[PDB]
């Protein structure tokens, strides 16, 4: 169909250009719809990562086209970043545009509560955006929301705040996670020394939370009593840990002391305690600790294995760690939980195993135990990962003698952990930190080295060990190809949500997580570097493939593991 106007100037567009470019025509930004060229540029601008410094041209364009940008729910964040709050006329317009925008996604609404949005109408609005999220999503973000208190105006609490508190009084699951988060900040002595206004603020936050709960009904007061009971329980575990920690001797003597003390309800009141919601998981109601099963691990900090008696008479396992700062793991495991949720949002079930972590103090807390066998024991006892799987998930019809479904969970889970460990740059890649389950689930332990901190010379770029590759059947196996395909899928899916990850890390810049506190200004930036948003989709996949080749040929990785094994053998 020959078209005569194929290569000719668009005369209708040129006409509107002459009238829209006229300085005599007063800015009618309400009816302005961007042309194709403006839309393509606008799409790039609305997609920028929060760390990218915006030029002046985007703010004037977005304002000029402010009535057009009102149809993008995700553009409210970019438009408001362009508005020059110093001009009251522009501010009145900026506040007027905000009220008409299509309500943005809650995932993006966390960005408006960061310290960067200081306008009280904007912050009361940001709370209005968070006000629409479901409690089930809020529980995934409460860790970040409480950190967001670092950016709020401390004076309104001493006198957005009402919104966060209002939801907790209705749902006990949120109240539990909120409560422990507020307690953790109220005990951080480092914050009291570095920012006494904030520490006193946190004292006010813990106090304010108590005041709001106090005004509730008897059932809410009962909720309060449970928190008071909760406080006594954690205090007992800390005292017990101190009594057990003071006992100089072999693991057996400490274990006997731990079990006897847990059993001695008359002195420790830990064998039989009042009904308390479990600190690690507020959805499970507990009656006490099982003394006979509490044991100390052979770690430098000797974690305690604790089995909690559930209301129904069941056993809920939890780990109490003393001597380690679990706040880093708490945030990270929250991030792992969030990464897992995003993949499932796209129906990409990577079979992630997000183990729960809860810091109960700046030095101790509860962590969920996931059934797994240490890789050091697996490698020492069975020789190869396939021998391990053949023993626990034998399937005559499955790949490599392992049930195809079990192998599928292993491949998906291995890929999921492999991608998340690349994204987070986990450094402490010792064989003690990888746990493998009989059902194929893979999870990481001991995140003592994160954000790229690696004491070893020439570390491999991605956590893919020769034993892990042999676990998938080798470079010639179908599962190894299925693993790689899932990695590309996950990389692209997470690349799409790099904005959410950078939004959450931005709220943690003022959170004294060891690897964040080392370079807080660069914390949000480090996550962006892992999203590699600068590469195209083709280059990113080419890069990921190159990454596997670069990681597989790193001969030096095997040498460092043997040296570490020799040092651990001498320490044991």
């Amino acid at each position: 169909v020959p078209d005569p106007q194929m290569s000719m100037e668009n005369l209708v567009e040129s006409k509107h250009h002459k009238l829209a470019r006229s300085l005599r025509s007063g800015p009618s930004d309400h009816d302005l719809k961007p042309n194709a060229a403006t839309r393509d540029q606008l799409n790039i601008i609305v997609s920028y990562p929060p760390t990218k410094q915006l030029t002046y041209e985007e703010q004037d364009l977005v304002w000029k086209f402010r009535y057009y940008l009102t149809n993008q729910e995700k553009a409210l964040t970019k438009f408001l970043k362009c508005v020059n709050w110093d001009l009251p006329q522009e501010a009145k317009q900026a506040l007027e545009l905000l009220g008409k925008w299509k309500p943005m996604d809650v995932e993006d609404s966390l960005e408006l509560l960061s310290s960067h949005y200081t306008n009280p109408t904007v912050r009361r609005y940001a709370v209005a955006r968070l006000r629409q999220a479901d409690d089930e999503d809020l529980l995934m973000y409460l860790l970040q929301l409480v950190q967001a208190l670092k950016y709020e105006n401390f004076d309104d609490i001493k006198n957005l705040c009402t919104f966060l508190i209002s939801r907790a009084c209705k749902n006990s699951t949120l109240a539990n996670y909120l409560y422990w988060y507020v307690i953790v900040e109220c005990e951080d002595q480092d914050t009291q020394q570095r920012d006494p206004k904030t520490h006193e603020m946190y004292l006010n936050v813990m106090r304010r939370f108590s005041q709001a709960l106090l005004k509730g009904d008897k059932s809410v007061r009962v909720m309060r009593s449970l928190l008071a009971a909760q406080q006594t329980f954690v205090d007992r575990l800390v005292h017990l840990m101190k009594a057990v920690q003071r006992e100089s001797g072999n693991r057996k003597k400490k274990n006997e002391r731990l079990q006897a003390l847990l059993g001695d309800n008359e002195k420790m009141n830990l064998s039989d305690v009042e009904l308390i919601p479990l600190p690690l998981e507020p959805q499970v109601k507990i009656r006490g600790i099982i003394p006979e099963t509490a044991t100390l691990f052979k770690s430098a900090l000797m974690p305690a294995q604790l089995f909690f008696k559930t209301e129904d008479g069941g056993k809920y396992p939890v780990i109490f760690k003393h001597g380690d700062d679990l706040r880093q793991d708490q945030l990270i495991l929250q991030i792992i939980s969030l990464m897992d949720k995003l993949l499932r949002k796209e129906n990409l079930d990577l079979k992630l195993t997000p183990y729960k972590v809860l810091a109960t103090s700046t030095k101790h807390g509860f962590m969920q135990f996931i059934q797994s066998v240490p890789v050091a024991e697996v490698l020492d006892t069975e020789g190869s990962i396939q021998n391990f799987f053949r023993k626990y998930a034998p399937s005559e019809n499955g790949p490599n003698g392992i049930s195809a479904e079990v192998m599928d969970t292993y491949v998906k889970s291995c890929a999921g952990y492999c991608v998340i460990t690349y994204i987070l740059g986990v450094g402490d890649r010792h064989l003690d930190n990888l746990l493998l389950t009989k059902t194929g689930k893979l999870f990481h332990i001991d995140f003592g080295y994160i954000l790229g901190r690696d004491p070893k010379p020439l570390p491999p770029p991605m956590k893919l060990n020769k034993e892990m590759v042999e676990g998938m059947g080798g470079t010639q196996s179908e599962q190894y190809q299925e693993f790689r395909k899932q990695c590309y899928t996950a990389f692209l899916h997470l690349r799409r949500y790099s904005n959410l990850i950078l939004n959450l890390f931005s709220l943690m810049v003022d959170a004294n997580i060891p690897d964040i506190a080392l370079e807080p200004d660069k914390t949000v930036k480090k996550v962006q570097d892992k999203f590699r948003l600068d590469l195209s989709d083709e280059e990113a996949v080419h890069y990921m493939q190159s990454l596997i080749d670069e990681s597989v040929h790193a001969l030096f990785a095997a040498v460092v593991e043997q040296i570490h094994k020799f040092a651990q053998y001498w320490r044991k």
């Binding site: 169909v1 020959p2 078209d3 005569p4 106007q5 194929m6 290569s7 000719m8 100037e9 668009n10 005369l11 209708v12 567009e13 040129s14 006409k15 509107h16 002459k18 009238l19 006229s22 005599r24 025509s25 009618s28 009816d31 719809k33 961007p34 042309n35 194709a36 839309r39 149809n71 949002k345 796209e346 129906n347 990409l348 079930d349 599928d408 395909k485 899932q486 590309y488 899928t489 996950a490 692209l492 899916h493 799409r496 195209s536 989709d537 083709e538 996949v541």
Partner: protein, 468 residues
């Protein structure tokens, strides 16, 4: 992508249109005109590309007779030892761009674009072709608002696993927009998936795809489904109620809602939708005259811009009788203006240039003021720069008469007079050709008086709007 054109001497690389893992699309110049080339890089030569090439040749033969269907005209297996290339005619605009390029499509143009999409699906089904990738990015629109569905990609995988969708980024998501116009039934449970690459498409599948494409047109460029909302649609976890509630036209909204239906048994045939909406979402004028008359211009026999103007001029009396009757009749005229305006920029003969002006003069009294100022006014000033002095004079005569008919000034043209009308003809008052200066002197008084009438109306409207 441009590097692949170095081996094709009949195609000269022009611009890159997009790059994905599956297909890299670029525009090239050929002896026949502009062409879109999708280049598939052959990484594994053991792939049975001959089987796909034969399928594409079958598509060309099956779709050769469809007027609203554009199959791949050329498939090259070994165009280069590195890649196989597909060639098809280039269309001025894709539907994705057309929505944001001025003039903005009026209600009558929106109905016409929807009507042509349905006609393309109906024709493809009767011709034995199923699209399998019906999206707003594949429904092309020509300079005369003729819709051509292009990029028949029978090589794309038909079925995708629901549980492992990541494998769809190269098959379905080449453009990274996360827009999914695949029929819901084409996602299948991954326990089956771990010949769906080319499982025979049900007609109900294309109806689903057309509904998403038809929806994007009615949602101002707003996609109908995102991957999460669409997968949730198949699983019942998502429904694009917000976007569907965005279809302002109730008649167009009903048609769209039914076509993107998740259950194939509820999707009708393309011919049934045209019949169901005949006289409702699509006025009768589209079927009886617009489609048959307009089909002459989309035919293989090329009508030059000059010939098109003469053909329209010859039929002008019949067009007005068919569109206005003896007398909502203006609804059809918006579409009619598009045929003339698409030609004014390529007219070569003086006889045609005058004829084009005659058409504008006869149609001008029958168009809405918004259409007069937006679609007619810009072309007359273009003709005012024509090489024929008689044309420059007539352009001024035409512009003077057309503007005297403007009784209402659109909000976008309040300052059209001082910055576009008056400054646009100002160069005519000093033209080298005495006939032009004569036409200027003969009309300068009329142009000024017309602009003054406009200013008085704007002032009265502003006074009334201030008192509102």
């Amino acid at each position: 992508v441009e590097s692949y054109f170095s081996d094709i001497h009949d195609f000269e690389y022009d611009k890159s249109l997009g790059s994905t893992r599956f297909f890299k699309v670029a525009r090239a110049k050929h002896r026949e005109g502009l062409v879109v080339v999708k280049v598939f890089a052959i990484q594994d030569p053991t792939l049975p590309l001959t089987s796909y090439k034969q399928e594409l040749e079958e598509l060309k033969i099956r779709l050769n007779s469809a007027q609203n269907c554009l199959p791949f005209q050329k498939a090259s297996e070994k165009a280069s030892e590195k890649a196989a290339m597909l060639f098809r005619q280039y269309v001025r605009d894709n539907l994705y761009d057309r929505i944001s390029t001025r003039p903005f499509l009026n209600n009558i143009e929106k109905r016409w674009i929807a009507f042509q999409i349905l006609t393309a699906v109906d024709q493809a089904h009767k011709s034995g072709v199923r699209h399998g990738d019906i999206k707003t990015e594949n429904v092309m629109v020509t300079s005369w608002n003729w819709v051509l569905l292009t990029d028949f990609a029978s090589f794309k995988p038909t079925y995708l696993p629901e549980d492992n969708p990541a494998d769809f980024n190269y098959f379905f998501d080449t453009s990274r927009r996360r827009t999914c116009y695949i029929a819901p039934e084409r996602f299948v449970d991954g326990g089956m998936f771990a010949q769906r690459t080319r499982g025979e498409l049900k007609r109900a599948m294309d109806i689903f795809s057309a509904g998403c494409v038809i929806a994007e047109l009615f949602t101002e460029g707003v996609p109908l489904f995102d991957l999460s909302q669409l997968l949730a649609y198949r699983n019942g976890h998502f429904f694009p109620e917000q976007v569907l509630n965005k279809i302002e036209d109730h008649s167009i909204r009903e048609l769209v809602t039914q076509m993107i239906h998740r259950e194939p048994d509820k999707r009708l045939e393309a011919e049934d939708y045209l019949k169901q909406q005949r006289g409702n979402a699509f006025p009768e004028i589209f079927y009886t005259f617009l489609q048959p008359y307009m089909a002459q211009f989309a035919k293989e026999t090329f009508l030059s811009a000059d010939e098109r103007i003469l053909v329209i001029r010859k039929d002008l009396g019949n067009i007005i009788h068919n569109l206005c009757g003896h007398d909502p009749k203006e609804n059809g005229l918006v579409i009619l203006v598009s045929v003339i305006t698409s030609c004014l920029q390529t007219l070569k003969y003086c006889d045609s240039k005058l004829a084009a002006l005659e058409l504008i003069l006869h149609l001008a009294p029958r168009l809405s003021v918004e259409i007069l100022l937006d679609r007619i006014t810009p072309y007359l000033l273009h003709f005012s720069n024509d090489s024929v002095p008689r044309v420059r004079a007539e352009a001024l005569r035409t512009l003077t008469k057309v503007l005297a008919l403007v009784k209402e000034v659109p909000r976008n043209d309040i300052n059209i007079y001082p910055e576009y009308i008056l400054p646009g003809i100002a160069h005519l008052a000093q033209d080298d050709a005495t006939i032009v200066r004569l036409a200027y002197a003969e009309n300068i008084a009329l142009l000024a008086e017309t602009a003054l009438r406009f200013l008085e109306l704007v002032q009265l409207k502003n006074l009334n709007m201030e008192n509102d």
